[PDB]
Structure 1
Amino acid sequence: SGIFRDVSLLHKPTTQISDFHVATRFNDDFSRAVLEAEVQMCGELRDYLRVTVSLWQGETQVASGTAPFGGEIIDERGGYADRVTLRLNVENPKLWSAEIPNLYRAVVELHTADGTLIEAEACDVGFREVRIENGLLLLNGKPLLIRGVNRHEHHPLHGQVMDEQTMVQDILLMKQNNFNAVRCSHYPNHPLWYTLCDRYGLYVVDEANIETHGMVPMNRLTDDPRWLPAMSERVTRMVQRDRNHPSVIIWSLGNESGHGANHDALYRWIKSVDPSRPVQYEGGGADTTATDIICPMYARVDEDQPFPAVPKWSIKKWLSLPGETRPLILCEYAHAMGNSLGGFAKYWQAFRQYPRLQGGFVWDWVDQSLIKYDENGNPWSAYGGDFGDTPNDRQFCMNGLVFADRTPH
């Protein structure tokens, strides 16, 4: 517990940009795109205000649009006089992918017609389309093969405080070891992570901070309307913060919280508000009405584990169950606890052979060991129970592909 992420002060004008959404849509072959940016203001509207959204490629401005406030009519009472949407045509855009993380810069200016800037906001933009078609998760029209890993925010000295150096070290090691994607197990990450993933190129699953594993049954709270409010904020506020990052390609409703009606409602809320990314959720059997992707944890390649209610079918079999058509990407597989990863090649061989088996995210990146000191000042790696915590789950906290200090296993 504690104040574990940054604290800042931000001084905005009273008439200000209060939110902005960037979307990119394409033609059939990706040779043309439209960048659409909805901008919202707070403060007093005045006829002289304008918003200009400019797109840059390096030091070169490639597109721009300017307009006064006042959105399209939306219903019988009119439109949002406090919003405006700018539409920029972009020819032959440089596409973003984990392989070639091409980025442009969008600058959003709140200014006056006669040229005075009130304030500006901005973001890096990656032109990419993510869609599921014919049962395949496609990026810029090509099917992905997710070489992913689950990554918790963990430091052996600092606990859950993340720093730039460490984040960078992790991405470099992931890329160095042929990973192309990461799942934010199991909560929104420090803001800087998204920026680094956008720039260095990794596909990200952004996941809401909701996990109720210890309830009995697991969906006790998630099926209760009384908890929909609290849950809703965990999902909505995550979307509101992270929706403009290109690295984020899939939203996740949380983890190990069974399957409750609250999941369904929240799944639908995201689909409505941001049609640009698939929504996944593993709870309740990995193939519920709240997920666009079959996303089991620890389902085996050839072997079925037919548990009641929530079976873990062999992944090859799952794909073809009567009426199923979704892509399958394991949210967690290959439990890297101690001397492990046995059978990893089995997964890969399957992923390569079956189009709809589009990979998975190993569990997990780094061991959650903590440093303790022996009377003599020499440090050693500690696990559950080592701080007098009890009950505890002993070494279950170390499941990484690398030791806490980033040395590889």
Structure 2
Amino acid sequence: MIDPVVLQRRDWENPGVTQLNRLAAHPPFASWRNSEEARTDRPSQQLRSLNGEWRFAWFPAPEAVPESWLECDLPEADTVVVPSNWQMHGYDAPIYTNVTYPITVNPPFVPTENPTGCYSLTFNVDESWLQEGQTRIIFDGVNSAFHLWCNGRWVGYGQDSRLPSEFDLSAFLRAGENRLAVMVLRWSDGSYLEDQDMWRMSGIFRDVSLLHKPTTQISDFHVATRFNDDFSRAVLEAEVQMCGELRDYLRVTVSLWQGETQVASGTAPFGGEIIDERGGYADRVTLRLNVENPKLWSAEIPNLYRAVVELHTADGTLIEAEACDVGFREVRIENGLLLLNGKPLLIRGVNRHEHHPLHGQVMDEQTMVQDILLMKQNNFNAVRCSHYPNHPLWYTLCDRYGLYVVDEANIETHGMVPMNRLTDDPRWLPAMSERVTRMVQRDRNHPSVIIWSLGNESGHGANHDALYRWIKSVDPSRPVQYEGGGADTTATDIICPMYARVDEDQPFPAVPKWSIKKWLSLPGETRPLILCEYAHAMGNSLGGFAKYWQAFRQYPRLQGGFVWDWVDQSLIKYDENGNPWSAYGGDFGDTPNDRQFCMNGLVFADRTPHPALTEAKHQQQFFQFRLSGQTIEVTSEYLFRHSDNELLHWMVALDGKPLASGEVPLDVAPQGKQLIELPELPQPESAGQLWLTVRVVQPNATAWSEAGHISAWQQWRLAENLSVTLPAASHAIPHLTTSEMDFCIELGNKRWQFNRQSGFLSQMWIGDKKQLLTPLRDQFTRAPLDNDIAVSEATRIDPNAWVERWKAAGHYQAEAALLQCTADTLADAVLITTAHAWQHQGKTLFISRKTYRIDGSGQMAITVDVEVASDTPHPARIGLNCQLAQVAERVNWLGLGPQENYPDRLTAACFDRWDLPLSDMYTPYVFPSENGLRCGTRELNYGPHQWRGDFQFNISRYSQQQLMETSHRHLLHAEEGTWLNIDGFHMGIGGDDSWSPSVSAEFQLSAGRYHYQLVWCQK
């Protein structure tokens, strides 16, 4: 077995040892030996990728690894791609757990059965690399700890899954063929700081590379940009550090480029200013470059310069060059406001994990770019790196596309009891400090990073305070935030709670979540408030999103938040027929697990939007609208840019029929206003409601959007002319036929049947074709949403959860008892009158009283009046349902759409005539629930049927019962015909969080008495 010191020391069970022989952290290097190549950011011959086909063998523990593996390839090993997580190749199971550690909590110890990945690579090194200078290896991401060997000799050890580990291999390599051996441990003492709510995987999951640096080398460099009061003048200050022999002829030149133009330059020998009694840094120099009228960086306009750092002899010999993109911007908190370039930010943010449904936690350029384009297209301007430093390319892309970044240390100890057990313990300070300090050393030159975060969900400990102060000391250019221990501790510049509600206090002992409006004004409080997590987007969610944005806009110091979160953490599995399906917690034999709680995204794992995404896009719009008469007032919420790629399209329609349209160019200054006078509108021919819709279209393509991109919209009701004309009097009269079992009504080809034992319409005919597969009955329940269920930890139930209260009240079990069923014959109609009581174990929950009026024109008017017992939990819905025999291709409606919308999530929807394929009327949430509702609907058309009134509906091939009984979307089967759920009223979906009741009072069905009417006819 591999030995002796390595297995003896057990460095992976010691928080005092987080590395051996690891090189110092630093900003991204490429060691260009040509300055023009550095400037253009073209590939460097001194930076080689070792990604591709490696050899891999799996072992149950490090003790099981054979000693021979160190010297030569194992025959039993396989050839696999690197980077990769070994769970994704099927070597063992990924584990989904939220809070509870995937291992027994016994710090610093891990299980003796410790899955061990043995990676190896035979590769070539050219003689030229070994004759001179330094050859290092860089592992961007290894999860969670590893020992490294080169050509059979031990090199070093590393921890922290989310930052690069670098080792000098100069003395280990030979010309020609070389062999790396990497023993990766799944569990280590590092795991105690990696308890993020996500899939627990392992392996070499980020890039591996070889870097060649000269012996005399740039070892570090920091770029700062400071400004005068109006940002018309800047000073770029670049501190550069060298390693190697100090020499008088050595120089650094820092040159600043705007495209092909060099805007500034400075050259100096080494030797910093005196700093104390012993002198200064002889191995450092600081260059100061004056920049007049700098082009400022923001998410709105991501202006970048190129800084080239040249290490050279005085007489002109370049030793090496390094470089970075530079964004001129100031981030500061002043008078309680987070300012960027002097202006208060409004953070339209989202948390984003590094997740791919096929490749797990391995990130690629295409996916990153896809994510960024989708975020910006949906009006996000900010991302939180939940909850670890990201793949290095992410920051480069955020610099270039323009997104504000919160860079977050890889520290989460959520499963500890209490949460701060390790973070208050000075014995864990060393391991914690490296996760903070090495992040700052790596990422401090990226303009996109505007805020540092100390980690996530690790309570508040003294270690947090120490590292807070370390950051403030080494980098005063960026605020520091941290949510743990109450979101407003001494370790944060920003009040940054998770799931604090807008108006409602949640006064938990020790760590209350105050109403965000209340929080700001607590005695002595002065800081800005930006939620690190809010609007939990789990399944059918984002109810109440508009309430946050209204408050964000009204309150200066409420400066936004980061939605939780971007993308469902579902993984692809394959069934017996090789068909892909989306899996969640427990689907890999992983146990214990927290099931679907890993799926909280605005988008599906494949980046298909959830309906909630449009709600986010709309509330995060950068243009605000008001209407007065026929004048539209457009207000810009851009801070820096003019509206130079925007036109306003307007449209007036009468119940879906276009009356007039037109367009006006937008010419709005940042924070400015523009008045748009609409032309005189034509008088409507018919009766009904006029609707004005405006939309902001971007005529030109950008780096992040296509030509014609819609960025903003708004609707208003204009004039309404109420119909005062009586329908044409029909000559025909429907006939009533009575039996003991049934009332049958006939009118031409049309027939209705009411069952006298049940009291419901049991059948209808058009021609002599039956229309119903299941009778039309009241429905007071929905297939529970993730929010209704309100579970965040599989073993924990909130008795106050809506699903728990509905179940215990017997809402799902309640049986309809007939009280009345009579028939009457009027002058031109047959009138059926019914009353029902729903009861559970002697308690009447609901009473439904109806009339059905069928006239000579063939229309059936259903009037429904419902009583709900005041002491039963408010019902999910008050409506009717039936299974129609007809399966049609299209659904046509006049109401809110086109996408799924609910009462507390309908601001993004527009009133119009919508026409979709039936399949679009179902939302494929991975965990199935009530879905696909559209609200404020006045007319619905499906095949031969038309329903009219003022209702909410959903329509699909899946019953509420099936949705309720099915755990995974791939297990759903289309039922015979089409299930129609038509509601007079429907409860909000909530989502302020998904583990407690979160539906606001105004969206609960608490009125006790409810009235609605539907007219059912043939089209």
TM-score, normalised relative to structure 2: 0.40
How much has 1:398 moved relative to structure 2?
0.2
Partner Cα distance (2:425, 2:243) in 1: 35
Q: Which residues in structure 2 correspond to 1:6-405 (within 5 Å)?
A: 6-405=207-606
Distance in 2 (CA, whole Å) between partners of 1:76 and 1:58 is 44
Partners of 1:301 and 1:80 lie apart in 2 by: 52
Give the distance between the partners of 1:278 and 1:33, measured in 2 at CA: 20
In 1: Cα distance, 2:275 partner to 2:249 partner:
23
- Offset at residue 306 of structure 1 (A): 0.2
2 CA distance for matches of 1:265 and 1:301?
A: 32
Q: Distance in 2 between matches of 1:274 and 1:47?
A: 30
Deviations along 1:335-370, whole A, 9 cap, x unmatched?
Answer: 000000000000000000000000000000000000
Report how far residue 333 of structure 1 moved.
Answer: 0.0
Q: Secondary structure at the match of 1:292?
A: coil
Q: CA deviation at 1:134?
A: 0.2
How big is each residue's C-alpha offset from its partner over 1:263-300, in whole Å with a ceiling of 9 and x where there is no partner? Answer: 00000000000000000000000000000000000000
Deviation at 1:329, TM superposition (A): 0.1
What's the secondary structure of 2:273's corresponding residue?
coil
Q: Which has the larger radius of gyration?
A: 2
CA apart distance, 1:404: 0.1
d(CA) in 2 for partners of 1:349, 1:80: 52
Distance in 2 of aligned mates of 1:258 and 1:355: 28
Alpha-carbon distance in structure 2 between the residues aligned to 1:47 and 1:131: 39
How far is the alpha carbon of 1:182 from its aligned partner?
Answer: 0.1
Q: Write the distance in 1 (CA, Å) between the matches of 2:229 and 2:266.
A: 24
Q: Matched residues in 1 for 2:231 and 2:417: separation?
A: 48
Cα distance, 1:374 vs structure 2: 0.2
Alpha-carbon distance in 2 for matches of 1:111, 1:375:
63
1:156: how far off?
0.1
What do residues 292-324 of structure 1 show as CA deviations (whole Å, max 9, x unaligned)? Answer: 000000000000000000000000000000000
- Offset at residue 147 of structure 1 (A): 0.1
For the residue of structure 2 that corresponds to 1:204, the secondary structure is strand
SS of the residue corresponding to residue 213 of structure 2 reads coil
C-alpha separation in 1, matches of 2:428 and 2:494: 25
Cα RMSD (Å): 0.2
Separation of aligned partners in 2, 1:282 and 1:56: 39
Structure 1 residue 192 displacement after superposition: 0.1
CA deviation digits over 1:70-98, x for unaligned, max 9?
00000000000000000000000000000
Q: Deviations over 1:24-51 (max 9, x none)?
A: 0000000000000000000011110000
Residue 214 (structure 1) shift: 0.1
State the shift of 1:59 in Å: 0.4
Residue 262 of structure 1 and its aligned partner are, at CA, apart by 0.1
In 2: Cα distance, 1:337 partner to 1:238 partner: 30
Greater strand content = 2
Report Cα offsets for 1:171-192 as digits up to 9, x if no partner.
0000000000000000000000
What is the deviation of 1:208? 0.1
Q: What is the CA-CA distance between 1:257 and the residue it aligns to?
A: 0.1
Distance (whole Å) between structure 2 residues aligned to residue 63 and residue 265 of structure 1: 38
User: Separation in 2 of the partners of 1:277 and 1:270?
Assistant: 9
Structure 1: 5+ residue runs without aligned partners?
Answer: none
Distance 2:440 2:345 in 1: 23
Shift of 1:385: 0.2
Q: What is the CA–CA distance in structure 1 between the aligned matches of 2:406 and 2:535, rounded to whole Å?
A: 18
Structure 2, gaps ≥5 residues long: 1-201, 611-1019
Matches of 1:140 and 1:379 in 2, distance apart?
48
Say which SS state the counterpart of residue 432 (structure 2) adopts: helix
- Deviation of 1:207 after TM superposition, in Å, equals 0.1
Pairwise CA distance, 1:327: 0.1
SS at match of 2:203: coil
**How far did 1:107 drift?**
0.2
CA distance in 2, matches of 1:57, 1:304: 50
Secondary structure of 1:395's counterpart equals helix
Mapped partners of 2:214, 2:427: distance in 1: 38
Shift of 1:250: 0.1
Distance 2:434 2:504 in 1: 39
* Helix, strand or coil at the partner of 1:62: strand
Partner deviation per Cα, 1:231-262 (whole Å, 9 max, x = no partner): 00000000000000000000000000000000
CA distance in 1, matches of 2:315, 2:260: 24
Find the aligned partners of 1:260 and 1:50 in 2 and give their Cα distance.
45
The alpha-carbon deviation at position 20 of structure 1 amounts to: 0.0
Q: Secondary structure at the match of 2:596?
A: helix
Deviations along 1:127-167, one digit per CA (max 9) or x if unpaired, are: 00000000000000000000000000000000000000000
- Residue 227 of structure 1 deviates from its aligned partner by 0.1
**Consecutive aligned runs of 4 or more in structure 1 exceeding 2 Å deviation:** none
Deviation at 1:201, TM superposition (A): 0.1
Cα offset, 1:210, TM superposition: 0.1
- For 1:97, what is the secondary structure of its paired residue? coil
CA distance in 1 between partners of 2:411 and 2:244 (Å): 34
Cα shift at 1:390: 0.4
2: CA distance, partners of 1:388 / 1:136: 49
CA distance in 2, matches of 1:215, 1:43: 45
Distance 1:123 1:248 in 2: 14
How much does 1:61 deviate?
0.2
Q: CA deviation at 1:384?
A: 0.1
User: 1:65: how far off?
Assistant: 0.4
What is the distance in 1 between the residues matched to 2:244 and 2:436? 27
SS in 2 for 1:316: helix
Give aligned pairs, total.
409
Secondary structure at 2:209 match in 1: coil
What secondary structure sits across from 2:367 in the alignment? Answer: helix
Distance in 2 of aligned mates of 1:279 and 1:200: 24
**Cα deviation digits, residues 177-223 of structure 1 (max 9, x gap):** 00000000000000000000000000000000000000000000000
Shift of 1:54: 0.4
| Cα distance in 2 for residues equivalent to 1:122 and 1:308 | 50
CA distance in 2, matches of 1:379, 1:95: 47
1:334 shift after superposition: 0.1
Higher RCO (C-alpha under 8 Å, 6+ residues apart):
1
Partner of 2:759 in structure 1? Answer: none
- What is the CA–CA distance in structure 2 between the aligned matches of 1:180 and 1:46, rounded to whole Å? 47
